[PDB]
């Protein structure tokens, strides 16, 4: 039922490694019976029920049963479960390729879209036919058979290379050893929460709760150099070999399909349409931010010159890779009086979580309720149920996995677990999402204290959660966040603006000790500190965007050389020789291949909606919040990205709001 919750969450997380392998073989045999039945039908006999609806019913049944198998590799603490889950991801990723390359299925769906009356079906069914046929053409199903087996052969190799690329990073346990003197200027709440060795030295891992606090506050330059070296050489040996195979294979499968490069292949399925416009968007944005980067580099270089003179170090005259985070933090403390170590005392995890939910309970008109005794994959994971405030309709659920552990996903992402689409029996599926982040842990007898940049990630990742649950379509491929890759970052990056409002920050803040709020002067300086270090921060994002476009344009190109090239050209900070950032670039194998520009591309749309609709009528206005929910979040992938923007903005988007929010034109 749409107003109940019992039984709508069929995901179980207590599967043994043997049960996963058994459930995988059963899922393949059951799903193949559906595809084989459609393939064994007459071309003049296919109808909407035995062909389109039959495939739509198994796609919802498959992606849900698949999620129970490919997800434990990212969260489970048992390594055998993570290993068995990976062998199911490899097994099923090659199975999806085998089912997509079926010529008999493609011959029958083109017959429906060319012979049947398209007026007797829903508009999402017509979009289902066009998108299903277009994906068949993007797999070479309209090409000779000897080149289909060649494309099917290479895509199965690309499937295993992308899984191994992230499996190496997820299982990386590389760590360094330092002494108390080598960890200068670091607070005692961080030093005392580290593993001590036999010779009284400390152990520091290469994950976010350990790497960033060191690179932002350690005064010892040699300690920051070793951490930067070890962090950018994670899986350097094995992931470089994968890039030596994956990138040539990506350009080879694109040339067989008629595309010049792999970048041109994936850009057709995005809102940017062409790669010539992407490189034009990045190069023109890099010019407006070039003078800003020069001012920040000169100020940072002066800070390094004075500190080396005051401490007695050897000033080399350049900004190294390990010096960037340490002196950008000093720019934040001197020009805006923002001490991140002091501000985190006002952002405990419980108060931030409560304030975050209450902010969107009133904005989007929803109701959140934690479920006691939750069946989860780890005891530190909480479950919440989302209802519609006005109608009591149970929209969906979502998990909260906020603290890092062994074998956990070491970045910050949101995984769609169940799509909010229709079932064969006419009912609606309960959408399930999962928020996975690596926030700070309770130390020094205090609750988890979050830095302000950790609250943004909490607000960003919750954007994908609301987009997953509020999206309600008819087919599983259009449900959730399954939209244009350069557009999925619109709902998530837009919620970050609520972390820079003076009134909303008071609803998120409460000192962990005396319960007092943040001082008025500090709150004003915090909002004014939005554009601090905005030059080098965006230039680094522009570099990663240009590297993604370059590595998918040129054929025989050294991945490490091209990253170091754009660093000295755009960012101005040279890449450390011997490192390899693309070897740790998990986005190259996580669906963002050639599409990393979407992080800056989607920001142009979010700022244009926040300034033209929200900032005018009020960022807490339920009228604009409901319009945003129904026109952007609810359609999901059932509509084009620009169509949903045109329905909300009542016009075409522009960079006017995006530029003035960055201090530019």
């Amino acid at each position: 039922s749409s107003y109940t919750v019992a039984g709508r969450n069929v995901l179980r997380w207590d599967l043994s490694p043997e049960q996963i392998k058994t459930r995988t073989e059963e899922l393949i045999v059951q799903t193949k019976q559906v595809y084989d039945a459609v393939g064994m039908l007459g071309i003049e006999e296919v109808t909407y029920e035995n062909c389109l609806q039959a495939l739509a019913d198994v796609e919802v049944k498959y992606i849900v049963e698949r999620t129970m198998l490919d997800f434990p590799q990212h969260v489970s603490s048992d390594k055998e479960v993570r290993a068995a889950s990976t062998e199911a991801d490899k097994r099923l990723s090659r199975f999806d390729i085998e089912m997509s390359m079926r010529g008999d299925i493609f011959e029958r769906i083109v017959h429906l879209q060319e012979t049947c009356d398209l007026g007797k079906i829903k508009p999402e069914a017509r979009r289902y036919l066009e998108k299903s046929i277009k994906m068949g053409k993007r797999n070479g199903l309209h090409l000779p058979e000897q080149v289909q087996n060649e494309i099917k052969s290479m895509k199965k190799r690309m499937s295993e290379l992308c899984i191994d690329f992230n499996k190496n990073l997820n299982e990386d346990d590389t760590f360094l050893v330092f002494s108390k003197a080598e960890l200068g200027a670091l607070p005692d709440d961080f030093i005392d929460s580290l593993e001590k060795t036999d010779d009284d030295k400390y152990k520091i891992t290469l994950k976010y709760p350990h790497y960033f606090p060191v690179m932002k506050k350690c005064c010892i330059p040699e300690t920051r150099r070793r951490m930067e070296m070890a962090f950018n050489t994670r899986c350097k040996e094995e992931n470089t070999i994968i890039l030596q195979q994956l990138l040539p294979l990506r350009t080879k499968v694109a040339k067989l399909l008629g595309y010049s490069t792999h970048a041109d292949f994936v850009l057709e399925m995005n809102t940017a349409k062409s790669t010539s416009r992407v490189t034009a968007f990045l190069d023109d944005l890099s010019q407006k931010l070039k003078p800003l980067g020069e001012a920040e580099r000169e100020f940072i270089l002066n800070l390094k010159k004075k500190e080396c003179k005051d401490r007695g170090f050897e000033y080399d005259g350049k900004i190294n890779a390990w010096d960037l985070y340490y002196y950008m933090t000093q720019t934040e403390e001197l020009k805006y009086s923002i001490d991140q170590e002091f501000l985190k005392e006002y952002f405990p995890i419980e108060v931030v979580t409560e304030g975050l939910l209450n902010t969107y309970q009133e904005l989007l008109g929803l109701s959140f309720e934690q479920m006691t005794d939750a069946h989860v994959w780890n005891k530190s994971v909480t479950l919440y149920t989302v209802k519609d405030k006005a109608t009591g309709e149970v929209l969906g659920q979502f998990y909260l996995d906020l603290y890092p552990r062994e074998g956990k996903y070491n970045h910050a992402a949101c995984f769609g677990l169940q799509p909010g689409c229709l079932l064969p029996d006419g009912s609606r599926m309960m959408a399930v999402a999962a928020l996975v982040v690596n926030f700070s842990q309770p130390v020094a007898g205090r609750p988890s204290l979050l830095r302000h940049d950790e609250v943004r990630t909490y607000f960003h990742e919750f954007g994908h959660v609301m987009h997953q649950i509020c999206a309600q379509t008819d087919f599983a491929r259009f449900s959730g966040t399954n939209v244009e890759t350069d557009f999925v970052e619109v709902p998530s990056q837009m919620l970050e603006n609520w972390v820079w409002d003076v009134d909303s920050l008071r609803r998120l803040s409460k000192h962990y000790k005396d319960g007092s709020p943040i001082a008025d002067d500090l709150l004003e300086k915090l909002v004014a500190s939005r554009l601090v270090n905005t030059g080098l921060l965006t230039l680094r994002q522009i570099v990663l965007s240009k590297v993604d476009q370059s590595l998918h344009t040129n054929t025989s190109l050294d991945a490490a050389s091209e990253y170091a090239k754009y660093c000295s050209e755009i960012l101005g900070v040279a890449a450390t020789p011997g490192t390899n950032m693309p070897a740790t670039f998990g986005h190259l194998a996580g669906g963002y291949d050639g599409q990393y520009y979407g992080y800056l591309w989607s920001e142009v749309f979010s700022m244009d909606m926040f300034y033209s609709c929200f900032k005018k009528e009020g960022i807490m206005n339920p009228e604009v919040g409901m319009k945003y929910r129904n026109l952007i979040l609810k359609p999901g992938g059932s509509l084009d990205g620009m169509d949903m923007l045109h329905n909300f903005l009542k016009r075409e988007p522009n960079q006017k709001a995006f530029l003035m929010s960055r201090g530019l034109h």
Partner: peptide, 4 residues
């Protein structure tokens, strides 16, 4: 989100 993006690589920090």
């Amino acid at each position: 989100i993006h690589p920090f």
